[PDB]
């Protein structure tokens, strides 16, 4: 079937939460390793010597559960490309700390955001870490500034390609590393079409779907528009994992219904021909050409 997960930012008890998650039919959960509102000081006193423990323990789950069911997340207050030196230094230290705790837990992947143009020092810190798990970069199709409403009188509203340039420059700085991949966020309005084709070729491992793009059917079930359906069809080929984020606005319907809609979409697709079938297991597998004159087969 298709694989999907749940994105959260409030996990009071880890075991109960993971249980409910798996119950609704989710395969993995993405969650913070530290508390998101718990800023740490490393350089200056007296807060430098805050008593521990600084986080919850590893012995709450099992090694294989860590290894298979949990994706990590970086805390929002961490901003390495700030213009205030102090904040930037603290952010560097905290970032390394969280990444190393992730390594200690044996996590299969870790989520990191791109929400602006300059992420040079972030790339530096991560590049240091690597030369010492996969890393999923959270990057949207549309920038949040090009996404707000026209309700400010003295600052009016109006370029489809800036968010791709962000990712491209990042990956160039990191030197086209294998352990670095895309996590594409999707929203209500969609860009053109040559664009969507541009995100072809890129190492997309996951797609993020908010609850706010699902319309409601006459019966009260969740559905999607047709352009969204087209895009989903195209993504299903690359074989990505989908993540649901946000609140259940259809409080009548549990998350299981979203997932069943997704499975329904997957099932009703133009099945694979004889080629596509034969071509199973060879996608992007390099081979040396045959020489039936110099060699014998």
């Amino acid at each position: 079937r298709v694989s999907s997960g749940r994105d959260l930012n409030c996990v009071p008890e880890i075991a109960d939460t993971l249980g409910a998650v798996a119950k609704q039919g989710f395969d993995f959960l993405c969650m913070p390793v530290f508390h998101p509102r718990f800023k740490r000081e490393f350089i200056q006193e007296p807060a430098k010597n805050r008593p521990g423990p600084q986080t919850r323990s590893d012995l709450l789950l099992s090694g294989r559960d860590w290894n298979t069911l949990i994706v990590g997340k970086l805390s929002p207050w961490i901003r390495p490309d700030s213009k205030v030196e102090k904040i930037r230094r603290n952010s560097e230290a905290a970032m390394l700390q969280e990444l190393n705790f992730g390594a200690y837990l044996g996590l299969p992947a870790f989520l990191l955001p791109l929400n602006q143009e300059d992420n040079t020092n972030l790339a530096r810190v991560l590049t240091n870490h690597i030369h010492t798990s996969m890393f999923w970069m959270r990057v949207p199709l549309v920038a949040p500034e090009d996404l707000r409403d026209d309700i400010i009188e003295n600052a009016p509203t109006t370029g489809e390609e800036k968010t791709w340039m962000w990712w491209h420059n990042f990956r160039t700085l990191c030197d086209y590393s294998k352990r670095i991949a895309v996590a594409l966020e999707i929203g209500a309005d969609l860009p053109s079409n040559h664009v969507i084709d541009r995100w072809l070729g890129e190492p997309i491992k996951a797609a993020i779907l908010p609850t706010s793009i699902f319309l409601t059917n006459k019966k009260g079930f969740p559905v999607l528009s047709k352009m969204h359906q087209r895009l989903i069809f195209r993504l299903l080929k690359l074989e990505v994992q989908f993540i649901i984020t946000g609140t259940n606005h259809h409080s009548e319907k549990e998350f299981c219904s979203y997932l069943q809609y997704l499975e329904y979409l997957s099932q009703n697709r133009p099945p694979p021909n004889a080629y596509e079938l034969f071509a199973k297991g060879y996608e992007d597998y390099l081979q040396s050409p045959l020489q039936p004159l110099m060699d014998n087969l």
Partner: protein, 294 residues
Amino acid sequence: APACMERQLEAARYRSDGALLLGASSLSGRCWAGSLWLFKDPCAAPNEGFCSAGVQTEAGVADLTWVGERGILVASDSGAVELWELDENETLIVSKFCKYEHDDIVSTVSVLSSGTQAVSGSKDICIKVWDLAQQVVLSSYRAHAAQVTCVAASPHKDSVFLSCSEDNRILLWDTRCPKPASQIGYLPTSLAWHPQQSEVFVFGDENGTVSLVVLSSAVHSQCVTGLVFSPHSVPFLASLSEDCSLAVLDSSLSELFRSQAHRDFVRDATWSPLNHSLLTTVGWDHQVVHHVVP
């Protein structure tokens, strides 16, 4: 009431008759949850045995407000806005409603002049307006481009509030209009209206600088976390920061008092209504410190 209290204390608010409201959350260890507390005798805090009422929340407390006399509004880690009311004899605390409308953490909450509506802001960039009698959202406004840090209501008009963000904007709102928001260095962090005047307010910055709206002063080393005005007929201004210090300023942004009592982040300040010379502060070191101010 709960057996133990959480170690991180975030909010502290006096009411008219002198009672004290406290808010705590757990940020480390096994369980990350919250609790609320009422102390009629504030000098007996933070002892869970000498409280008058207390309750345990599902999740963490980020902010809270008195709603007149009986009500408590809470911003939550869940992404919910929560209303509790006290029992007739102030012996218990009970939930009135719990609406999940934000898609991420609710960072800040403020009540409006009339005492019947309220505004909420989140890390999901949406601002909403609530009617507290009907339990609905009247409005969702997505104007900012990043996380919202502080909203502040005006004490003289029931349609005007302020909003700040990590995108470096400060907006003035009036819902009476069709385009409600209007615009006005370093990032802004905290806000406060002047009680007397109806056009003046203060704001704090990422670097350590306070400003009257111009006028400016460098007060702390780290981020300004809060700003509160004294109830004096001519008010003083309390300033609390991340450098673990407190300061009280006069009407000229000149420093009058400074305290290093705390060993960690200071989170809130509240002036007592009985004695206008007294000020209380809380923090993540689990201290409730009482200050007598000249």
